[PDB]
Each structure stands twice: as structure tokens, then as C-alpha cells.
Symmetry: C3
Subunit: 209 residues, 3 copies
């Protein structure tokens, strides 16, 4: 079912993009985000501990944990074995997309141009990250792409801010945005993380009442 990732995208306005450099912060970070209503969590596989951080965050009730920076079929298998509910990649290859479809994995691949979208449509996928959004033309570029691909829906990620997120979310083709601002670099301050998540959780979306 390719509808799975579409449902996940509509659960929350903002999907935190987590880079967990200290594994001891994994549980407090997931707890603070879930407490703010941003329970759909992308744990990027950019760090040595990341699979163990995914297993820790899965222990938080209500956390919907996915793996990010899934670059190939082997990383998808390792993430799926760790119990990830969805998978995010910066871009799309035919090998990754065919493996995710064969494995029934809810993949949310990044796209930057029309050729990336067309490859995903050929694989049966029609939901994508627009990444890195602010470096590939931003909202005006996403609007031109959404105008061409009427059945596709998007999650812009890359340079999104609390100021620009509602502007992206006004577009009916945008289901959510990705961002790292909800977890500031440095030692986690769970009260500030929860407050930023509560604010992002309240963002209005044209696509989701």
C-alpha cells in the first residue's frame, strides 16, 4: 500500500529531522517531541549510534520512528529490522525504490527536479520530500513542480524555519514540512524542545484540517 506514507505525512505539520550525536539524548529528545505533538520522528542514519537511537525512541509511547538518510537497500533492511515505521532518503535511486516497494516499506524519498519525480512515479510512488528545499528554488520552485505533477504531494525539507513553514503549508500540495529547528544543536533543553513542538504542532495546513 503506497497510501501508508501519505497518512504518515498528514499526522503532524512538521517532521523533525534528528541528528543524534549523543545517544543518551535519544530518549529525552523523543519524549520532548512527542509531548509537543510532533511524534513523527526522522532519525537520520548519519551517526554511528543511529540504529540504537531508533530502538531507544521506539520505547517512547506514541513515537512514530522512521529512519532518515537511507541511502541504499542494505540501510533500509537494517532500519526495517530495527523497527522503523517509515523511511526517508535525500534522493531516489531505482534500486532503493524497487527494494522499498518489494519490502512493503513506507518510503518518503527526496526529489529535487522533475526527473526524480518521474522515476518515483514509475516505481509507484507519488509522495516525496522536496529536498533541499531552500537551496533548489524554495516555494516558487515547489509551486512550479506541484503545478506539473497534479497527483503528487510533497514534504519540503532543507532550510525550513518557523517563519517560512506556514507559508509552505498554505499550498494544498504540501502535506508537511521537515525541519531541524525544533531540536537546537547542543545539549537538549526538553522544555524548549516541547515548546517549539507545541507551536509547530499548531501550524495550519491547507491540506489537513
Amino acid at each position: 500500500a503506497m497510501r501508508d506514507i501519505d497518512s504518515v505525512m498528514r499526522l503532524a505539520p512538521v517532521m523533525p529531522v534528528l541528528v543524534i550525536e549523543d545517544i543518551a539524548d535519544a530518549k529525552p529528545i523523543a519524549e520532548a517531541l512527542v509531548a509537543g505533538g510532533l511524534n513523527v520522528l526522522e532519525v537520520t542514519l548519519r551517526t554511528p549510534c543511529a540504529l540504537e537511537a531508533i530502538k531507544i525512541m521506539k520505547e517512547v509511547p506514541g513515537a512514530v520512528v522512521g529512519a532518515g538518510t537511507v541511502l541504499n537497500a542494505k540501510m533500509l533492511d537494517q532500519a526495517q529490522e530495527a523497527g522503523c515505521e517509515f523511511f526517508v532518503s535525500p534522493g531516489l535511486t531505482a534500486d532503493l525504490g524497487k527494494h522499498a516497494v518489494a519490502q512493503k516499506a513506507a518510503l518518503l524519498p527526496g526529489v529535487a527536479n522533475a526527473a526524480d519525480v518521474m522515476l518515483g512515479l514509475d516505481l509507484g510512488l507519488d509522495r516525496f520530500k522536496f529536498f533541499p528545499a531552500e537551496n533548489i528554488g524554495g516555494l516558487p520552485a515547489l509551486k512550479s513542480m506541484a503545478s506539473v505533477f497534479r497527483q503528487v504531494r510533497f514534504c519540503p525539507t532543507g532550510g525550513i524555519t518557523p517563519t517560512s513553514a506556514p507559508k509552505y503549508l498554505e499550498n494544498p500540495s504540501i502535506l508537511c514540512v521537515g525541519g531541524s529547528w525544533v531540536v537546537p544543536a547542543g545539549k537538549p533543553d526538553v522544555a524548549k524542545i516541547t515548546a517549539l513542538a507545541k507551536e509547530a504542532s499548531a501550524f495550519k495546513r491547507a491540506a489537513v484540517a
Copy 2:
């Protein structure tokens, strides 16, 4: 013959990009454009009626009707069966390009970066839309690409305006531009459409005397 699409690109300075939301406007729009000298028409397959609009516009003498937003081999077959003389896509996949070559279809695929051009060259194609032009660096980005791919020629599309079109057309590597400004959104005003087409038809081109 891969030369077919190159000839089509040189016929008119501007190729209208048509989004026909009301099929009753198809004939008056094609008639007004042809009367202005912009007879090379891209009817995007973004709307339910679009194949029927293509059949209507083919009835206009002098209209050279193509299909746009051709995303896959099946859409190309449906457009070719409707009698389209050429085919436009926002991007290029190997499956679409190999099918167009096998079917002898005059395809004008979009490209946004060097990898897209190299895939097209591998398929035997050397004429592309540069799309969406104004969101992927515009004329300066197209100049860098044309400097690298000396044998390739381009049709920038996406954000082109009557003001910027001559500036793109000064570049000898650019054969034409694509635009939607010639048909304003709303109920067609055939006198205004014809006047805008006559102005675009007069645009000077370094590549075409």
C-alpha cells in the same frame, strides 16, 4: 530521425504551454494562437479532457499539436494515438526516452542538470527543454550548461516572460522558449491572445534568421 524535434523548435520563437481547463476553449485558443503565428502548441496532459482537446486543436489548419506532461511510455502511446506531432515531458527517464526512440516519436524532454542531458545523449537525443528555467538558475545556469554541451540546443520553459524571452533568445544555443503568458488564466480573450502571439512571433532569435 532525431532531427525532427530540432525542426519543430525552430518554427516559432515561443511554444505556448497550454493548460486547458475548459474543453470548450480548446478550439478558440488554438485558432487565436495560430492566427498570431504561434502554431506549435503544447497541450499538457494535466487535465481530464486533454486528449480530447488535442483532437479538437488538430482540426485547426496550421496547428502543430503536441502533448506535454508526458510522464511515461503509456501516456506517449495515448498521445501518439491521438495524433500528436511531438511530445514534451518535464523530465527524462530511460524508459520514456527508449520508448520514444523505438516509436519514432519526436520527444522534447525537460532537463535540469548535467546528468539529465547525459542520459538523453546516451539515448540519442540532443534537444531538451531547460525546465523549470527560472527556478534552476535561469539564463546564467543555462549558459553554463550550453558551454559544456556544445552540440545540445535548448528550449527554456518555466517562468519565462515577454521581457526575459528575447534575452534567452539572444543565446545561439537556445532555439525557442516555452511560456504560458500568451494564454492568460481565465476565459479566453481571443483578440488579446492573438495580439500576444503576434508579438512573440516577432521575437528575434540568434539561432533562427
Copy 3:
């Protein structure tokens, strides 16, 4: 050994991108660059004489000559037969990358977005040109990409200037930059070329002491 191209990238801060329109300038240009310490030379295959210019520049002691604008496996074979030590392409296709790996060719393919990097990683490559850098978001776009692909290292090329080159070179993920400014258009002035190469040779790099 995929480490070969990484070693080549660290040899000099700047890799001249040479477009040799007059073959008689090939030897004086290579001699002037090597005398300035920019001995890693990319001779683009954009000109009819380019393979003969590569053979001429190989005669200069200390010149490490590569071919640029290598668009397909056949051009790589012609360059490798001419004795090129490395190979540069504006973008990457699976056919070009698989051929370079099979032929043990030190390929430095261009990338513009995450899908291009992921294809290269799938082929066993992790060193790329970021091209054309200043038209695809520049340093901010390269920073977002280097943040995602922690094991990848880059050579930005396209619009780099003596002013911006040190700013790119401050990033530890950047090993070198590509540029054409060291050889100004027109008849070569070997004293000016050597002076510009000596200045670029002195550029500081976070990645290379």
C-alpha cells in the same frame, strides 16, 4: 582503488578547467600552470583538438593531465588511450560510472543533487564535482549536501572566483575547487597565468595542511 581520485583532489587547491581553442597554446598553458604549482589539469573534450592537446600537455614534466567533459564510455576509452591520469564529467550516468570502475579509471563525476550522489555511492564512488556550483545554490547548497553525505568529499566547479575559492576551501568536506579564471580567454599570457596559479596554489584548505 577508489582512493586514487581523492589523492588527486588533494594535490592542489585549484584544478584549472581548460578549454583549448588553439592547440598551439596547449604546451605554453600547461607549462605556465605547472610553473605556478597548479599541475593537476583538466583538459575538457569540448574542442576538436582536445585529445591532441592532452598528448601535448602530457609532455610537460610534472603535469598531471586528465580529460574533462567525458560524457560516455567511448570518450573515456579515447581519453584513457591518450594517457589521461583522471577523468571528469559534468554529471554521472550508470553506464559511464560502471565503465570507469571496470576500467580502473579515476573518475571525478559531477553531481548537482542528492540522487546523483546516491547513484555514485551505489557504483562505489564517493568523490564528486559539485557542478555547476554557483548555479545550483553555491556554498549554502553544498553545505546542506555535505551535511547529509558525511563520507563524501567535493570539488565545487562552475562560477568559482579567486574571491570565493577560499570560502569554499574553508569547508572540511571540500578538497579543492575547479575554475577557469587561471587561464583568461584570449591568447595566453604565460606570466599572468603563472602568477594566478601561484596565488591559487597558496590557497589555504581546511581539508589539506
